[PDB]
Amino acid sequence: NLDIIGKRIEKIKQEHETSWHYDQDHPYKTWAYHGSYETKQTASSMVNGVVRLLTKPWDIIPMVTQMAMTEKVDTRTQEPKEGTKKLMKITAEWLWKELGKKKTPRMCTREEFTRKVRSNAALGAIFNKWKSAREAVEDSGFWELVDKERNLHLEGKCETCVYNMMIWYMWLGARFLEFEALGFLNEDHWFSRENSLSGVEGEGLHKLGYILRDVSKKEGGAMYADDTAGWDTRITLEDLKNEEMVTNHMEGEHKKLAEAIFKLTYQNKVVRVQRPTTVMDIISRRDQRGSGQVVTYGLNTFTNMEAQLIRQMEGEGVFKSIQHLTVTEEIAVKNWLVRVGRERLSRMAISGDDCVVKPLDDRFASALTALNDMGKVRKDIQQWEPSRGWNDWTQVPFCSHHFHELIMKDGRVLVVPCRNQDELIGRARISQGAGWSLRETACLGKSYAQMWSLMYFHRRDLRLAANAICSAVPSHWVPTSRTHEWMTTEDMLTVWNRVWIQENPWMEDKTPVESWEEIPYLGKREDQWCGSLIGLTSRATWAKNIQTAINQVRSLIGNEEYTDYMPSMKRFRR
Ligand SMILES: Cc1cn[nH]c1-c1ccncc1
Numbered sequence: 001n002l003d004i005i006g007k008r009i010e011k012i013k014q015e016h017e018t019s020w021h022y023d024q025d026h027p028y029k030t031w032a033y034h035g036s037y038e039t040k041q042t043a044s045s046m047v048n049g050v051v052r053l054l055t056k057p058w059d060i061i062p063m064v065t066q067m068a069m070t071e072k073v074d075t076r077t078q079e080p081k082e083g084t085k086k087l088m089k090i091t092a093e094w095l096w097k098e099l100g101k102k103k104t105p106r107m108c109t110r111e112e113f114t115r116k117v118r119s120n121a122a123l124g125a126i127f128n129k130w131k132s133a134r135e136a137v138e139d140s141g142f143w144e145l146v147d148k149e150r151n152l153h154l155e156g157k158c159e160t161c162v163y164n165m166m167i168w169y170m171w172l173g174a175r176f177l178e179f180e181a182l183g184f185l186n187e188d189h190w191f192s193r194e195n196s197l198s199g200v201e202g203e204g205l206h207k208l209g210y211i212l213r214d215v216s217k218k219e220g221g222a223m224y225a226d227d228t229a230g231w232d233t234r235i236t237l238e239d240l241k242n243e244e245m246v247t248n249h250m251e252g253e254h255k256k257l258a259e260a261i262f263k264l265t266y267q268n269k270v271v272r273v274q275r276p277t278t279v280m281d282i283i284s285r286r287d288q289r290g291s292g293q294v295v296t297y298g299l300n301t302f303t304n305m306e307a308q309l310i311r312q313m314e315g316e317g318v319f320k321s322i323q324h325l326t327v328t329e330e331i332a333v334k335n336w337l338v339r340v341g342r343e344r345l346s347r348m349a350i351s352g353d354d355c356v357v358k359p360l361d362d363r364f365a366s367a368l369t370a371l372n373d374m375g376k377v378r379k380d381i382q383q384w385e386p387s388r389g390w391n392d393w394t395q396v397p398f399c400s401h402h403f404h405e406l407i408m409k410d411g412r413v414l415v416v417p418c419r420n421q422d423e424l425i426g427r428a429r430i431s432q433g434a435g436w437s438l439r440e441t442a443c444l445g446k447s448y449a450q451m452w453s454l455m456y457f458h459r460r461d462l463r464l465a466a467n468a469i470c471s472a473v474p475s476h477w478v479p480t481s482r483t484h485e486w487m488t489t490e491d492m493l494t495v496w497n498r499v500w501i502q503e504n505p506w507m508e509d510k511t512p513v514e515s516w517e518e519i520p521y522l523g524k525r526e527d528q529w530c531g532s533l534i535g536l537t538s539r540a541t542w543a544k545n546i547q548t549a550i551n552q553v554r555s556l557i558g559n560e561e562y563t564d565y566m567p568s569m570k571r572f573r574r
């Protein structure tokens with residue numbers, strides 16, 4: 001409690017001494033409350049006009065148009081039983097060693113951090129003293145503040161590492177110290193599939209289907225894809241202590257700096273929350289996930305890999321009960337990990353809180369005691385109801401997608417990502433933040449269009465809309481995003497060949513594709529099942545009259561150099 005968090009709390013009181021009070025009508029039951037102080041302030045989703053003018057048939061589809069319009073944090077998780085705590089400690093110890101065999105923990109640098117801010121990563125900072133991250137990083141006074149907190153952390157204390165709720169934004173300084181100590185997990189790809197066997201970090205949406213098809217090839221039971229209800233709110237203090245064991249692999253300054261991030265900011269937290277009754281509440285708690293989103297991704301992947309290996313151990317009968325491991329169950333658990341752990345990791349695809357598991361057999365479906373007792377309660381099923389698995393890898397949900405096997409005219413086999421097309425069009429019609437020029441709006445539309453050409457070329461409506469947007473935006477204008485092989489001014493046919501043929505390890509024949517007409521679509525009925533408007537009168541008029549829509553947008557942007565991409569399609573090619 002207050003010996004670790006007091007200084008942060010003490011400091012905040014004194015900046016708002018004219019406003020402090022122990023408000024007696026505070027809604028917090030599971031968060032420890034400290035005080036309140038006067039403030040006044042809050043950005044909604046804005047429509048991208050370039051994408052909307054080129055997707056007119058979707059203007060009357062509520063699932064698209066509603067996407068642009070518009071008491072889980074205040075719960076507590078019970079402490080796991082002694083048997084569960086032992087399983088988690090043994091598995092976590094083993095997993096950090098496997099992940100560390102071919103990697104070396106190391107500090108990330110001011111230089112590395114500076115380069116990140118200078119090409120727009122979502123580091124979750126705040127606006128004050130400087131306007132933006134770019135300005136703060138370029139100012140020697142910032143680094144002096146960073147230095148003060150840094151020496152405080154080496155001394156085992158904290159003053160300014162406080163979360164702001166809304167996503168848990170910190171000041172750029174606290175973000176740096178997090179990245180210095182734990183950035184290596186992402187920067188050096190600890191959760192790549194090569195390094196972690198279950199992980200998919202850095203793999204790309206064009207590989208995830210092939211990875212699930214490789215898991216499907218293993219002998220075993222159904223494929224399980226159980227979602228957890230509010231994963232970040234079910235991270236226990238036992239979880240945070242197993243995660244901290246990465247520091248056992250560190251040395252020198254780095255070990256001390258990383259131990260301080262875990263001890264002072266993760267296992268103890270201070271948060272400011274807006275309450276319209278508009279005060280700022282200063283609350284603390286020990287458990288749940290509140291890191292930067294990139295460290296959150298890696299530690300979620302780690303704890304998810306651990307949880308799923310334990311659920312596999314439960315299905316395989318490695319231990320009888322979570323109440324208590326006997327001396328010899330401990331040796332059996334250790335021995336399972338050493339002899340088959342790596343094989344059992346290869347049976348999984350894990351992206352943070354999202355997993356797919358192909359267990360040895362279907363005993364897994366009813367192996368629920370460790371999973372429930374670890375607090376990883378499944379979403380949308382009763383606590384003790386057996387999991388429903390998937391019999392076909394092409395039906396399994398993963399990372400908001402499903403995956404199709406698509407046969408090219410020349411016999412070669414693509415495995416492609418897919419999701420309901422209303423979700424894809426709805427997302428592309430939305431921009432975030434203020435002060436967007438027409439050029440910037442056009443360049444964001446072009447980013448969506450090029451992603452569609454690379455990932456969703458097999459959807460008739462998206463290949464046509466992608467071609468239309470690329471025809472409507474000046475040819476040399478560079479795709480942008482405010483938070484990815486489609487981010488380029490290279491010819492997208494050249495990029496398609498590099499991604500799906502040349503660099504694709506599942507494609508043995510490397511014969512390049514000469515034109516977009518060689519690149520196939522889903523079956524027409526499959527395209528409709530996944531939300532295509534092909535067959536509707538609105539869609540036929542849009543396709544036939546597309547040059548008129550392209551010319552509307554070209555007239556708004558003005559007299560620029562444009563290319564016609566529509567004749568890359570059979571139906572427009574004379
Ligand atoms: C330090 C620096 C400067 N220009 N590029 C790098 C760099 C890039 C990628 N990995 C490590 C270093």
Ligand SMILES: Cc1cn[nH]c1-c1ccncc1
Binds near residue numbers: 200202204352
């Ligand atoms: C977490 C997230 C969301 N969209 N994409 C990712 C991602 C990208 C690359 N490697 C791992 C994850």
Ligand SMILES: Cc1cn[nH]c1-c1ccncc1
Binds near residue numbers: 204205354
């Ligand atoms: C799109 C998404 C969501 N969660 N994770 C991913 C992902 C993972 C790995 N590579 C690319 C993307």
Ligand SMILES: [Cl-]
Binds near residue numbers: 390395
């Ligand atoms: Cl199925």
Ligand SMILES: [Zn+2]
Binds near residue numbers: 153158159
């Ligand atoms: Zn601190």
Ligand SMILES: [Zn+2]
Binds near residue numbers: 402404419
């Ligand atoms: Zn589909």
